[PDB]
Each structure stands twice: as C-alpha cells, then as structure tokens.
C-alpha cells in the first residue's frame, strides 16, 4: 500500500552503490543479471517491485527477509523514505531484483 | 515461455467496428508497457497505440487516434484494442508487442504477438 | 514528425558482411533498436540501445550509433539473415514511435 513517491532516490541508489549491491552478487555465486519477467518504469515503481521481490513470499520462493542484501534492504528504506518503518526458483527472483536495481540506479537527465 | 497470443481479427465492412485481443503469459504484464504495431501487406511496420503499465496513459498515432481506444487488465493479463469507424486502409496485421519503459521513454520491443489478420471491404 | 530513412534493399554474397544504415536528425542522440522479420513471421527483435544483443542472438548481429547515421552489421551472412529489417525509434519531440521503411537483406543465390 506504501507508495515510494517521496523516498530520497540519490541517498537509496548511494546506499545500494556502496553496501546492498556486494551482497546481491555474493547471493548469486558472483554473478550478475544479464530474460527478464519483471520490469519497472521509474524509481518510485522499482522501489515498488524491489519491495514485493524482496521480502514479500510468492509462489516459488519464500521470503528473502532474512538474507543480507534483504536486511540491508530494510535499512536503506527505513532511513530515506519517510514512514516506512537457495533454490533454483529463489536465484531466478534475486536475479529479476538485480535488473531492478540496475533500472533504479540509471542516470539522470 | 514468455508470450503474447492474439485474436478478434477477421473480415468486416467499413465503417464497421471490430475489438482485437491479446493475452500475456510468461511475465509480470503490469509492469510493462503495451503496444499495438500494424502491417499492411507488402508494406513496413507502423506504430498504432500505446499504454502505460498502470493504464494511466494511453497515446496513438495520428492516423487511427479518435477511431481506435486501446486498454489493458492488469489482473486478467490482457491487452485490447477496440477498432472503430474501420475503413480500407486499416487492413493490415495486427501485432502487440510488449516495451519496458523508463519515464517518458519506450525501450525496444522484446516480444511480439503472432499477429492476427484485418481486414476491411466490402 | 521524425523519419527514418534505410534504404529498400541490401544484397549480400554468402560469408560477406552485410551493412544495413539507418538515417535520421540527429540519430546518435536516440536510442536506435533494430527488428527481423522473416517472411510470414512476427518481427523479432535483434538488437537493442544501439548495439546490445539480446540472448537469443548471435554475436555475428552487431549494431551501431553515430552522427546521422546508425548501423546493422551483420557478420559472415548465412541464408539464414534473409529477411526484411526495421530500424526504429521512440522520438521524445512528438512522442511517437517510428520504424523505418525496412530493409529487404537478400543473401545472393
């Protein structure tokens, strides 16, 4: 129900940068993304996907909560958007969440 | 498994009016911008329509724009285009195709429907 | 109203490169993406962003972007590259999609 609409993108994009990015790829055996099912069309809408992604169960995976990058995760949105606060299934929804990231950390204009 | 699968086309008369479908499987539909592009016989591609992934904006082309409503279900994965006032020259096939967008801009089509055939005459 | 200009036809003996151009205002400043479309099929994208591969695609597909000017080059052609190519971009000025004419590559028998 949350909308990210007034989160501090510069400060969340710092964070992954720095801390959440290095414990994505550890997750993925040193691997980055590169078939893509999800997909978002600007931060406050990747935010939104990376929340569901991240810590939401779905129908093949459970909650990646409890991981690092999850838990680093949390923090990240706790401190900057106001009011907030492995199986083969798992590694293809943590890999969706890395092309995720790379759509959120793109440049600005 | 990632596919677009449509219907509705067929023959009708101008001035008619005929509704195109198209079904998503294989990837989360919501989060992705829809397109509708036509191709007459023998001729090049030509964009028709766009929606967001909200189905907050919808944009077409000036050559079908006041004739042609395109819309989306997010819950049922479905993509629909709603062709009225029909006339000859939109005898074409129909294709949707699937975009991920970024703010206002709209990235390569990745995948294409099989297309379905239209065609006005009397 | 952007336009983008290709010309109708580009011939090609088998094992020789095939070049296929793309024309328009100020093209390097777009994001070009260029499509196959085999005869009696839907088009297929083969390269994105200029000059990015999609997975399914060989390495022999390459593309490029510069000037007024974007290219498809086509490495060792095989009867296989037979088909009709598209060139296309989304033009932010009047916010609408253009192909170009297309591009009928024929591979000489």
């Known amino acids: 129900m949350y909308d990210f609409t007034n989160c501090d993108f510069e400060k969340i994009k710092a964070a992954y940068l720095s801390t959440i990015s290095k414990d994505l790829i550890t997750y993925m055996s040193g691997t980055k993304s590169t078939n893509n099912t999800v997909s978002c069309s600007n931060r406050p809408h990747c935010l939104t996907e990376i929340q569901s992604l991240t810590f939401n169960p779905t129908a093949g995976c459970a909650s990646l909560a409890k991981e690092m990058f999850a838990m680093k995760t949390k923090a990240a949105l706790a401190i900057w958007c106001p009011g907030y606060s492995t199986t083969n299934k798992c590694l293809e929804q943590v890999s969706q969440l890395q092309g995720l990231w790379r759509r959120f950390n793109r440049p600005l204009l | 498994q990632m596919q677009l699968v449509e219907s509705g086309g067929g023959v009708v008369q101008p001035g008619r009016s005929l509704r195109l479908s198209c079904a998503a499987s294989?990837?989360?539909?919501?989060?992705?911008?829809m397109h509708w592009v036509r191709q007459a016989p023998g001729k090049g591609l030509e964009w028709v329509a766009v929606?967001?992934?909200?189905?907050?904006?919808?944009h077409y082309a000036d050559s079908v724009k006041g004739r042609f409503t395109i819309t989306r279900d997010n819950s049922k994965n479905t993509l629909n285009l709603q062709m009225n006032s029909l006339r000859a020259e939109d005898t074409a096939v129909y294709y949707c195709?699937?975009?991920?967008?970024?703010?206002?801009?709209?990235?390569?089509?990745?995948?294409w429907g099989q297309g379905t055939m239209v065609t006005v005459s009397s | 109203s952007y336009v983008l200009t290709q010309p109708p036809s580009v011939s090609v003996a088998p094992g020789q490169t095939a070049r296929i151009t793309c024309g328009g205002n100020?093209?390097?400043?777009?994001?070009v993406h260029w499509y196959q479309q085999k005869p009696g099929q839907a088009p297929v994208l083969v390269v994105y962003?200029?000059?990015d591969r999609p997975s399914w695609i060989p390495e022999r597909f390459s593309g490029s972007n510069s000037g007024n000017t974007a290219t498809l080059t086509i490495s060792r052609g095989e009867a296989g590259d037979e088909a009709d190519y598209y060139c296309?971009?989304?033009?932010?000025?009047?916010?609408?999609?253009?192909f170009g004419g297309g591009t009928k590559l024929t591979v000489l028998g």
């Open positions: 195709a699937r975009a991920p967008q970024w703010e206002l801009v709209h990235e390569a089509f990745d995948i």
């Open positions: 294989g990837f989360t539909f919501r989060t992705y911008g």
């Open positions: 929606i967001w992934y909200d189905g907050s904006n919808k």
């Open positions: 100020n093209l390097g400043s777009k994001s």
């Open positions: 962003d200029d000059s």
């Open positions: 296309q971009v989304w033009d932010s000025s009047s916010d609408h999609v253009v």
